Design a protein around this ligand. Structure first.
Ligand SMILES: COc1ccc(S(=O)(=O)N(CC(=O)NO)Cc2ccncc2)cc1
Ligand SMILES: [Ca+2]
Ligand SMILES: [Ca+2]
Ligand SMILES: [Ca+2]
Ligand SMILES: [Zn+2]
Ligand SMILES: [Zn+2]
Length: 159
């Protein structure tokens, strides 16, 4: 596994997230479900607890965007970069963005929102790309790998 420059991690254990807007590709509940299930992947094997916000600035702001959308990393249309997220910190740090030029699906016919979001929340919590693994930079009975478990635990520990 790998972490970010200067080993950044959330200094607290109670983290807030807000789903800022929604993809047209799914019903809102499917997006909510994939996000919650993405958070649980990490919440279950750490002391971290996630709460949802509907107003104001949450630590992890979750949004769908296309092309240029207010940061230094514009999206690139269909394919290539499906999503990205930021290391722990204030402001844009911790936030996760999803390219809405991808076809976000509940299943595997398009791009699975849950699977990318899980990988993205890994970035929101201080994990970078592995060398093996959910944090491996490639979208390909699902279980969080030992290499992934080792990563988040060498940072926050177990529950
Ligand atoms: C299911 O977990 C994912 C989630 C997203 C991606 S990605 O969007 O296709 N990835 C960007 C990425 O890692 N964002 O966090 C592309 C990339 C291209 C070149 N260098 C590094 C990465 C892949 C697997
Ligand atoms: Ca943030
Ligand atoms: Ca793209
Ligand atoms: Ca889309
Ligand atoms: Zn972005
Ligand atoms: Zn990534």
């Amino acid at each position: 596994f790998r972490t970010f420059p200067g080993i950044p991690k959330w200094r607290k254990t109670h983290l807030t997230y807000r789903i800022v807007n929604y993809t047209p590709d799914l019903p809102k509940d499917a997006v909510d479900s994939a996000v919650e299930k993405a958070l649980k992947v990490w919440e279950e094997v750490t002391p971290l607890t996630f709460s949802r916000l509907y107003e104001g600035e949450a630590d992890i702001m979750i949004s769908f965007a296309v092309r240029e959308h207010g940061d230094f990393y514009p999206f690139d249309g269909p394919g290539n970069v499906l999503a990205h997220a930021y290391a722990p910190g204030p402001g844009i740090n911790g936030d996760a963005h999803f390219d809405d030029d991808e076809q976000w699906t509940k299943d595997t016919t398009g791009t699975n929102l849950f699977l990318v979001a899980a990988h993205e929340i890994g970035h929101s919590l201080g994990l970078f790309h592995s060398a093996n693994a959910l944090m491996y930079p490639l979208y390909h009975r699902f279980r969080l790998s030992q290499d992934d478990i080792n990563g988040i635990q060498s940072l926050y520990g177990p529950p």
